[PDB]
Structures are given as C-alpha cells and as structure tokens.
Design a protein around this ligand. Structure first.
Ligand SMILES: CC[C@H](C)[C@H](N)C(=O)NS(=O)(=O)NC[C@H]1O[C@@H](n2cnc3c(N)ncnc32)[C@H](O)[C@@H]1O
Ligand SMILES: [Zn+2]
Ligand SMILES: [Zn+2]
Length: 1032
C-alpha cells in the first residue's frame, strides 16, 4: 500500500482515480469480466443536447450508476451504451434564438441545410459538455460509442419501425382537430400537451342569436371561446332536452328549461316548452357576418349537450373543436376556417385580420355589445394547454396530420404496463396508468425541419403510399439513382421521388419530420441498428431489466418507449421503472437557468468531490418525491461521510507502515470485544445495505452505511488508537490492524456503487485490485453478534447521558468525578462487561448499577393552589410554607401514604388531600440526573480537593506530553523535567507523583521557583513554566 500523507484535495484524488480507470480500462473490464454471467439489461435514456447539465440531472445519472455498478458487483453483466437526443423542437428553438431568427418563414430564408448544419454544430457542443459532466460524476456509460438520434444508422432503424407500423395499417394521415402551437406552427402529441397545462382566467360569454323568420326571438348561445364566434356554423341542442321560449321585456329568448332561471335574471315569463328535436333546422343570424357559410347557421342535435352548464345551446365552430368538427361533418354543413398557421385572423375577418385570436377576446366582447347581441359574460378559471417548449398558448386547430394508431393496441398497452414493476408503486395506475386509460392516437407529424423525416411517399396520381424501411428499399423504389451515402434528413430525402407500383406516377415524400419522442422511444431497436445489424446482441439486450429517469418521462420517454415497442413488437420494452422526483432549489422552487437557481454540478464536483455530491443526492432524501437540494447538503456529506472515511483510511495506512503490519503475514490475534462489536456491525450493515439495495432503496442503504461509518470513527477507531500507537506487535495490536483492514476492504466494497472514487482509492491501495472489479461482499453471519450490538447500543446511550450531565453542570470530562450510578429497571445488559469503558469514557472512579433510585433521590413538597386554594382560604400560604419545611422522610412518607397532616404555628393540625400537594423528586445533595426513561444516569458532581488535584495532575501530564511533541524528542529518551508553578500546582504534582511518573518517561522531575528561558504553558486557569533537559 502507498501513503496518504501529502495533502490531496477531493478534486485531485478523483482526478488521480479517473486516470487510473483510463489506464486500466476498468469500466470496459468490469463488463468483459462478467461475460457468461447472467445479464442485467439497462437502457440509458438519452439526454437532450440543447443545454448545460444542472444538478437535477446528476440525480438520475447517479442512480443509474449505482444500479449498474451494484448489479455488476452481484454477478451480472451490465452493458451501458450512452445516447444523445438531438432532434426536434427542443433543439430547433434554441438554435433559432442563437441565429436571431424565428418561425418557419425565417428558416426558409436562412436555408434549410444551413439551419440544419447549425443544429448539428449546437448538439455537438452540448454533447461534449454532457460527456465531461458524466465522466466527472463517475457515471460509467459508453460515451465513446454512443447512440445518437441524428446518425444515419439510428434513423434507418426508426424508418424500419415506422415502415413496419405502416405495414399493419397503424400509420395513417387524417384531417383532424388537434392541439396546435401557433408559434412553433405545428400540431403536438397528447403526451406533449399533458406537459404544458397552466391555470388561466378568460371569458365565457352568452350571445343572442336572432331567429330568422321571427321577431324579437333570439337563441341564447354559449361559448367559452369568444374568438371562435366569427366562425360560427351551427348551434347545438340536445335532442331529448326540454327548452323554453321565455319572454323578457320586449324580447323572447330560447334557453334550456333547467337553466332559464339562471340565465334570465330580473324578470321573465315562460311561454311554451319545446324538445331539442323540435328546435332542429331553425335558422338564425350569426353574431358576425364577416365569413360566408354556404350550409349552416341552423340548429342541430348533438348528444353531448349538457344542461348542467351554459344555456343548453352551444355555439359550434367546426375548425376549432373536435366535437364541433364531428357534428358539422355529420349534418353536411360547410367547413370554414378563419385562422392562419400562426394563430392569426385571416382576411375573412377584416377588423381583426393579422391578430392572434386569443388576444382579441376583449375586443370581441365590445363588438358583441355593439351589435346588441351580447347577453352575459363571466370569468373562467380553468386549466389551459400551453406549448411545452415555447410557452405559447395552444389552439385546437383542424389540420392534416400523421398519426400512429395507438388506440388500436390500447388493451396491449395496459397489459404491458400491468407487467411493469414501478418505483414508486403509485405511478403504475396513477400518473402513467391514468394516461394510458385516456389514450388518443399519437400525432407524430411535425411541420418542421430538424428531425427524423417521416418515411412515407405518396403517389401524386393515385395517393398510394410507400414506406421504405431502409436505404436499400428507398433505392429500390426510386425513379432516379440514390447514392448509398444518402443522408436521412431534410432536404436530402425530399429530393428522392419514387415510382408508384400502382400507376407509375411520381411519389413524393410527405414533408414532415416526426415527434422527437418517437426517436428516443425507438432506442431499444435503433441503438444497435436492428434489424440490419447486431441481431443477437439486440436479443440479449431486450427487454430492459430497469430504466431510471425523471417523473416527467411518464408523459415522455416512459410512454414513447412503451408505445413504440407495443406497436412494433407487441411487447413491453422494460420490466421495471424508477420514476425520479425532480430536484428543486433550496427554497423548493423548480430549477432553471433563467431563474438562476440551477446549481452547476461541475462546480460542486470540483469543490466537494463527486463522491460527496452523489452521497448527498442519495442520502439526504428519497428520490421519488420532489427534492430540496443545496450546496450545504453536499458540504455535510463531504465532511461527515467522505472525509471521515479518508481519515480512518489514512490513519490505518500511516500506522500500518510505521508498525510494519502485513495482511499477507499471519499473526497471533488477541481479538477484543470492541473488535468483535465493530465486525458484527460491519456484517449487519452488509446484510441490511444489501436488502435495501435489492429493493432499490438507495436512501435506506446509504443511511445504514453512514451510521456504521460514524460508529467506526467516533467509537471503534477513537477508542482503539492506543493499540495502534503502542510499540511492539503484540496480539492485541495485530488484532486491531486485522480488524481495521477487514473493515476498510469490505466497507469500500459496500460503498463502490455509491462513492466510486474514494471506494477505489481505499480498495485498490489496500488490495492492489480495483473495487469495481470485485464482488459485493456477503454477510458473514458467524461474525454477527446480536447480543453484543444490543449492549453496546445501551452503553452508548449511557455514555451520552453521562456527557449530557457533565455539559449541563460545566464539569469538563478531564476533571474526574467520584461515581456514576445507573438505575436500570431490568437486568437486560451485562453491565459488568462495560464497567471499564463507562468509567474511562465518563472519567468516574465508580460505576454502580441500581435497581431503583431510593438511595439517590429525595422528595420536596409544595401546595397545588389551583386545587387547595378555597379549602384553606387565607391559610394557603401558611400551609404551603408548612409543606416546604418538612424533612426528607416526611416527603418520602407522603408519596407512599398519599395522606399528610401539617401542624401550623398555632398548633392547628390540618389534613392535606393527595391532589392538594405538588410532589417534586430531586436528586440527593451533590448529585445530578439525566434520564431517557429506559436508563437513568445519576452523576456525583461534588468536587473534593483530591479530585481537583488529580485533575490538575492530569492537565500537567497532558501539558508535558504536548511539549515533548513540540520539541521533536525521541519517544524512547528519558527527560529531566523542570516545572514551576504556584503552590496548588506544586501540591498536586507532589501528591500524584506516582501518576505523573507512570504516564511520563521522566528521568527526573524538579519543581523550581524560577526557570531560565522556560516555556510557559496553560494548565487550567494557571500558567506553568516547563523546561526539558536530556540525560547526559
Ligand atoms: C430520458 C430523456 C428524454 C428522452 C429526453 N431527451 C429528455 O428529457 N432529456 S433531458 O436532458 O431534458 N432530461 C435528462 C434526465 O433528467 C431528468 N430531469 C430533468 N430535469 C430534472 C430535474 N429538475 N430534476 C431531476 N431530474 C430532472 C429527466 O427526466 C431525464 O431523466
Ligand atoms: Zn411552441
Ligand atoms: Zn399511383
């Protein structure tokens, strides 16, 4: 083993370990060495290369590393291939800002290829930043040969999946009302929409729709979206609902019967009743006539019309509502649209053309009043969908899109999810399962530029569709030569046309790219270029035994993985999911670069070490709920846990070298009880840490290890230092080194998944072998001693109570005290075995175990004025004083009898009730008490001259020992000590001459009045002059 003497920062140690890992190919070796062992299949969720990693990203990569390292150590091969997510809106928008452009028209002007090249350059920059962060965090994952979603082979596998889905009839094009982002100018999927809901307040209005062929009669139409009123095509009523013609003032209003009293306020008179199907076909005047409707402006039956809210007459705009689209289509009414692709009014609405529709709500209300059609308005507090990338409010907008028909396999989705073990369990049928139950088809087409091109070609002539699964299939169908090096991106694939197998017409590729979530969802198949390559490796690497990503992937990678695999293979792509709560700042606020509360994990790693950051991320709280985090928690992990291990390790190395201990040599071992206890704690920790890790309880396993590390340092090492400090390799010293060597090797093995850097530094130096090539240690039950653990835990509690008393009464432990008495209710612990430990640790001359406190306490008596006030009147203070004057035995009698008589000054005898007296139990004179209920410790705090003088002699002994170290004197030489001090020091040194001589290797001791050029030292509150000569 090598020394740990030269001061090394945490960063320097981890850099040294990192280089050791590189030179030895330890990561690669930890995989290859498990060839033929059972597989544990792990999929890396690919980080989006559109920004810098923050400390929240360190949680998931820490947990994935713990799992992979642990499963490797317990006898599994864990292949770890990194991945980078590089397509889609999350990349495009950031690049647009870098370029100072915005929107699809600006991208066309900039140039599609030039824009895409900028995207490629940006993702490459971010990949390197993420790679460096991952390496310094110690998350072993192959970033030399990662999968990358922009790579041609990866895209080809995605094409093969999409082509296979198309073969089944599950990829189709349709004109549907879909959630739509007016800024990004594209439809969005249902999982993307679920990620962007925000509470808003807007206006729902009731508008009068004047009935044609009548007078003073208006329908009361209702809508939550005033901006859709110019596009009105029909009014919807329920067929079997009852409506009333109600007269108010000079007008008559048609409204639902159950809502009339709410809608019509002040005064009305119901004239007639009508069913919903009776009102069918009645024409009316639209609130706006800017747009011309060919067929419409009538009343139709819709089954979804409710009488619970609104008026029972619902304004329908077919282009901006799925129900509205369906009902208008059924009744053959003309479809109309008044909005461009940017969410702005077209020329068909003159007064508002070129304005965002949701910003016209206030002006629409005023226009409604001016036409005298407005009848009511109210505020609507509800959730509304916003774009998960650009924060623009969404619209529901009729649009031609491509869909993956996920609903066709909904039953298979639920069955696959039912096979998955979720952490936390509630996600399975909660956040994730509920999303499966409300499944709609997956809108995958994005009218964008940077992404996986949707590989569907349509014949211009007969609309036949061809979906090439590969470059070879693309080449086979193309009407022109297609080079083998064709890049599977826009615009290169848009220059490829096919010959239609049906009519020989020209086939053109649909222009869209696909949802970025499909790319990552395809990684089980695309990361190995399946089925074109690595068919056998893929089969061994499917399904995954676990994945671990943030909770937002329930609307992300968790869903897209499940959907792609279910549509493609029918099978669940994973057996087990760790759904991780998000890291927040120290205030509980979400982490963001804009908010400035996103800590840099690289700075934390540089300052405190990755081992400390990882430990704090694992041990401070559980990973399943939102997590408050701070630099302070990392600092505490470094000083309390990481530094403590390093110091114990450095202590062992220094004294093992000095004493020439050799773990390969065989010694006669005199194992002590403290050796047995720490070994029992070691293997009990091994057992309980393994049990938690087997159930992915990282926090509980970490906390268990931290407890053991505290016991190892604060108790085992601290109390065993003499056996390392002593000279000569006796049986006890050899046992100490043997015990500590086993603890350090096994503990570092335990810690290897958690704190990989320091664990290897200890283990490799002690054994010559990397800890990460080792097996996870097994619990040796023969070294577990449950009784010994139980007693030492009781001893620690007693020592803690004793220290508490000493601190409370300002009695420093260096000052010996006469006795500690322990009151125990039961003879559970063999206290005789720990007498020397308790007396040493508390510095008491005597340790006595008592069954009760009768010899240690007394009773004083007072009067309960709230209970005995009226009974004695003006004599209450005389009786209360009478109780306080009673002797110790009188109080002892009262607590046993419960009845008491007090004789007042006049001789008047009075009787005291049990509840009239307040009883106080006090320790006997000179004693002090602390109790935890189970144990009552009674300490004699009374000081004698002999006790004080012994304390002075102890202080003299320590002062001399400190002065010897300052002079670099040999530990073997005997010294001539000269000492000067006042009479109290002189008397103490004289009286305890034997004690001084036993603890100091003194050739002679001279007490002088004055010392020439002496060293003044501070012994207690006194100053003592020392001077050391050497025997000549
Ligand atoms: C599995 C990854 C997806 C396919 C996608 N590329 C993506 O979300 N990429 S990411 O880089 O934005 N996310 C990386 C991982 O970090 C999690 N995460 C993101 N933000 C936080 C946060 N504040 N606290 C904790 N974890 C967080 C993501 O869920 C993902 O696991
Ligand atoms: Zn958007
Ligand atoms: Zn054709």
């Amino acid at each position: 083993m090598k020394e740990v003497n030269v001061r090394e920062s945490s960063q320097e140690r981890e850099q040294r370990i990192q280089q050791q890992w590189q030179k030895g190919n330890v990561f690669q070796q930890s995989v290859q060495n498990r060839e033929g062992y059972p597989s544990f299949v792990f999929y890396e969720g690919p980080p989006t290369a559109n920004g810098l990693p923050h400390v929240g990203h360190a949680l998931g990569r820490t947990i994935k590393d713990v799992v992979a390292r642990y499963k490797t150590m317990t006898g599994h091969q864990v292949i770890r291939k990194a991945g980078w997510d590089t397509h889609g809106l999350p990349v495009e928008l950031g690049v647009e800002k870098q370029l100072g452009i915005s929107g699809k028209h600006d991208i066309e002007k900039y140039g599609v290829e030039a824009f895409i090249n900028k995207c490629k350059e940006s993702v490459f920059v971010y990949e390197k930043q993420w790679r460096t962060f991952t390496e310094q965090l110690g998350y072993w994952v192959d970033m030399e040969d990662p999968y990358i979603t922009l790579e041609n082979s990866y895209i080809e596998s995605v094409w093969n999946v999409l082509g296979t889905i198309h073969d089944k009839g599950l990829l189709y094009k349709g004109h549907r009302v879909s959630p739509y982002c007016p800024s990004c100018q594209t439809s969005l999927s249902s999982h993307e929409v679920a990620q962007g809901y925000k509470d808003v307040k807007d206006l729902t209005v009731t508008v009068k729709f004047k009935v044609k062929n009548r007078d003073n009669e208006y329908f009361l139409g209702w809508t939550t979206t005033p901006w859709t009123l110019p596009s009105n095509v029909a009014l919807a009523v329920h067929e079997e609902m009852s409506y009333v013609r109600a007269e108010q003032g000079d007008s008559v209003y048609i409204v639902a019967e159950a809502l009339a009293d709410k809608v019509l306020k002040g005064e009305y008179s119901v004239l007639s009743h009508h069913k919903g199907n009776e009102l069918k076909g009645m024409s009316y005047e639209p609130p706006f006539n800017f747009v011309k409707v060919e067929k419409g402006h009538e009343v139709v039956t819709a089954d979804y019309v409710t009488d619970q809210s609104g008026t029972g007459v619902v304004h329908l705009a077919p282009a901006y509502g799925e129900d509205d689209y369906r009902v208008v289509k059924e009744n053959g009414f003309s479809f109309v649209n008044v909005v461009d692709e940017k969410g702005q009014y077209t020329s068909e609405v003159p007064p508002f053309q070129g304005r965002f529709v949701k910003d016209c709500d206030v002006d629409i209300v005023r226009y409604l009043a001016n036409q005298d059609v407005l009848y009511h308005k109210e505020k609507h507090e509800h959730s509304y969908p916003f774009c998960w990338r650009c924060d623009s409010p969404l619209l529901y907008y009729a649009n031609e899109s491509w869909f993956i028909q996920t609903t066709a396999l909904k039953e298979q989705f639920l069955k696959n999810n039912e096979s998955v073990k979720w952490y936390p369990d509630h996600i399975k049928h909660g956040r994730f399962g509920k999303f499966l139950e409300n499944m709609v088809d997956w809108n995958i087409s994005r009218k964008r530029y940077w992404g996986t091109p949707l590989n569907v070609w349509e014949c211009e002539g007969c609309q036949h569709q061809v979906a090439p699964k590969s470059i070879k299939e693309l080449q086979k169908h193309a009407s022109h030569y297609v080079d083998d090096s064709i890049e599977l991106h826009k615009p290169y694939v848009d220059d490829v046309q096919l010959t239609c197998p049906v009519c020989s017409g020209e086939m053109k590729r649909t222009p869209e790219v696909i949802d970025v979530w499909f790319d990552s969802g395809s990684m089980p198949f695309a990361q190995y270029h399946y089925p074109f390559e690595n068919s056998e490796l893929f089969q061994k690497q499917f399904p995954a035994d676990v994945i671990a990503e943030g909770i937002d992937q329930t609307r992300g990678w968790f869903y897209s993985l499940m959907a792609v695999s279910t549509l493609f293979t029918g099978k669940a792509p994973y057996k087990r999911v760790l759904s991780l709560g998000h890291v927040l700042d120290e205030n509980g606020q979400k982490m963001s670069k804009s908010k400035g509360n996103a800590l840099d994990p690289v700075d934390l790693i540089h300052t405190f070490g990755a081992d400390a950051l990882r430990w704090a991320l694992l041990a401070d709280s559980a990973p399943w709920n939102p997590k408050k985090f701070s630099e302070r928690v990392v600092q505490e992990a470094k000083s309390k846990v990481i530094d403590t291990l390093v110091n114990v390790y450095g202590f062992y190395v220094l004294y093992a070298k000095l004493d020439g201990y050799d773990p390969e040599q065989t010694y006669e071992l005199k194992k002590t009880k403290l050796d047995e206890w720490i070994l029992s704690r070691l293997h009990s920790t091994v057992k309980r840490a393994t049990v938690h890790l087997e159930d992915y309880g990282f926090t509980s396993a970490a906390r268990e290890i931290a407890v053991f590390i505290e016991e190892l340092s604060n108790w085992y090492v601290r109390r065993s230092r003499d056996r390392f400090w002593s000279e000569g390799m006796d049986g006890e010293k050899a046992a100490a080194y043997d015990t500590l060597h086993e603890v350090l090797v096994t503990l570092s093995q335990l810690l290897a998944p958690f704190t990989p850097f320091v664990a290897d530094d200890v283990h490799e130096n002690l054994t010559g072998k990397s800890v990460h090539l080792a097996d996870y240690p097994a619990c040796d039950q023969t070294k577990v001693n449950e009784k010994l653990e139980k007693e030492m835990a009781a001893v620690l509690q007693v020592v803690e109570l004793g220290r508490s008393i000493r601190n409370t009464h300002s009695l420093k432990v260096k000052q010996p005290l006469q006795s500690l008495s322990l009151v125990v209710t039961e003879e559970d612990v063999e206290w005789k075995a720990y007498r020397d430990v308790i007396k040493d640790e508390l510095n008491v001359k005597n340790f006595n175990v008592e069954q009760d406190d009768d010899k240690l306490v007394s009773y004083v008596l007072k009067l309960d004025f709230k209970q005995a006030g009226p009974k004695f009147g003006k004599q209450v203070n005389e009786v209360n004083q009478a109780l306080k004057n009673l002797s110790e035995e009188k109080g002892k009698e009262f607590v046993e009898q419960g009845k008491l008589s007090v004789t007042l000054a006049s001789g008047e005898n009075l009787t005291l009730e049990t509840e009239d007296v307040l009883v106080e139990k006090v320790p006997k004179e000179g004693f002090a008490v602390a109790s935890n209920g189970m144990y009552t410790a009674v300490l004699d705090t009374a000081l004698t001259e002999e006790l004080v003088q012994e304390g002075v002699a102890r202080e003299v002994i320590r002062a001399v020992q400190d002065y010897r170290k300052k002079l670099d004197l040999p530990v073997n030489s005997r010294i001539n000590l000269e000492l000067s001090g006042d009479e109290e020091v002189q008397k103490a040194v004289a009286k305890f001459e034997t004690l001084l001589q036993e603890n100091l290797l003194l050739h002679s001791l001279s007490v002088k009045e004055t010392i020439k050029n002496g060293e003044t030292v501070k012994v207690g509150t006194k100053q003592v002059v020392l001077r050391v000569l050497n025997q000549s």
